[PDB]
Amino acid sequence: SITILEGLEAVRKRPGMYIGSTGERGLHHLIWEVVDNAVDEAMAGYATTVNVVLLEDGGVEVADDGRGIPVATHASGIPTVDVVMTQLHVGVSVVNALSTRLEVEIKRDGYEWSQVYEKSEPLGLKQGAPTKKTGSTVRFWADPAVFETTEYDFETVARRLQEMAFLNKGLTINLTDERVVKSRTFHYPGGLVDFVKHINRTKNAIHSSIVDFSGKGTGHEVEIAMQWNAGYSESVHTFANTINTHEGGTHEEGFRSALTSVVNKYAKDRKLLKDKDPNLTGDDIREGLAAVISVKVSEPQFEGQTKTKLGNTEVKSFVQKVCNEQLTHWFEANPTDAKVVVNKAVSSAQARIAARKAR
Ligand SMILES: Nc1ncnc2c1ncn2[C@@H]1O[C@H](COP(=O)(O)OP(=O)(O)CP(=O)(O)O)[C@@H](O)[C@H]1O
Ligand SMILES: [Mg+2]
């Protein structure tokens, strides 16, 4: 009588529940799912190059030079690729459910492997030529029965790929469109500094020396870069495992609480703010601040309706202790720059009082 919808069947029935929408956002989610999976290699230290190709037929190719996708037989008894590609827990399997076809070309374990999924169903793993080379290529063709549009937007892809490249300084991402060949290449050796530079271009940076520092702990790693501009508002970009957390969370909060205390204490020693005067607020310190906070968490939990909010309690305290130590170093290290960004803080506090008094 009743029908229970499990696995990939559910995804097809309510794709939006998993992807977002059956519109542009959802369509591009297929790419995000796959490219993410590739970049996770580059992040771990195995991939160096990730190539995205928008094929003429409307397919997408995503090739990396990581360790490949395990082909070896899984605990289930079916090859590990098949598990990844046909079973939930989001993750790339969803791409399979929502494509008419998915083709995987692997090089692991001394040869070339090829597996095809026709309407999510595996057609049988094939072993080819021997090779000492390692990595994976994924091809998928979005199902038009699912999506309102199947046309990918070059520029939306390019923007995301660009930021993935800032977050990973060892990585090179090549985007190429075979429709309408138009190509873009993203590699930033400066990493998060090249990111800050990018942000503060149109804005006039207040000080020349850009803040760059790192921290490593238990199941987490952080990397921060910041530079103030003549701006009246902040531009702080936060990331957890290359995922852009617009909602922000514990990594951003640890950073804020550290920066707020570092600036205030520094000001007191320099006598920049009158001891009698109340401590500068979080808002006045970040007035015109451009920053990037990129954490690497081993097991990350996200909260918020968006699911773009890092919730790891463990991380708030970690980022805080890292900033407290390294920002104190950068302040004392650059007394020139410190004097400017503090005065900017003072100006930001005086501007709020000026609006209050008159009128
Ligand atoms: N190109 C690649 N190189 C190496 N391993 C890959 C890979 N593509 C897939 N995998 C393997 O399969 C998994 C991808 O499955 P899935 O997308 O469900 O999980 P995930 O670890 O990517 C996080 P999420 O499910 O949130 O996307 C990876 O965790 C990895 O173990
Ligand atoms: Mg995934």
Where are the domains positioned within the chain?
Answer: 1-188, 189-359
Distance CA 250, CA 182 (A): 40
CATH 3.30.1310.10 fits 189-359, yes or no: no
Left (φ > 0), alpha (ψ -120 to 50) or beta: where does 191 sit?
left
Query: Ligand 1 atom 18: the closest Cα is on which residue?
Result: 91
Residue type, 279: N
* Class level of CATH domain 1-188: alpha beta
Maximal C-alpha separation, the chain: 78
Assess whether the previous peptide bond of 159 is cis (omega < 30° from 0): no
**Exposure class string for 261-297: b at 16+ Cβ within 10 A, else e:** bbbbebbeeeebbeeeeeebeeebbbbbbbbbbbbbb
Q: Which ligand is nearest to the CA of 80?
A: 1
Query: Ligand 1 atom 1: the closest Cα is on which residue?
Result: 38
Ligand 1 site, residue 83, Cβ cutoff 6 A: no
User: To what resolution in angstroms was this structure determined?
Assistant: 3.3
Left (φ > 0), alpha (ψ -120 to 50) or beta: where does 124 sit?
left
**Burial bucket for residue 235 (CB in 10 Å: 0-12, 13-18, 19+):** middle
Ligand 1 site, residue 37, Cβ cutoff 6 A: yes
Are the C-beta atoms of 273 and 346 separated by less than 8 Å?
A: yes
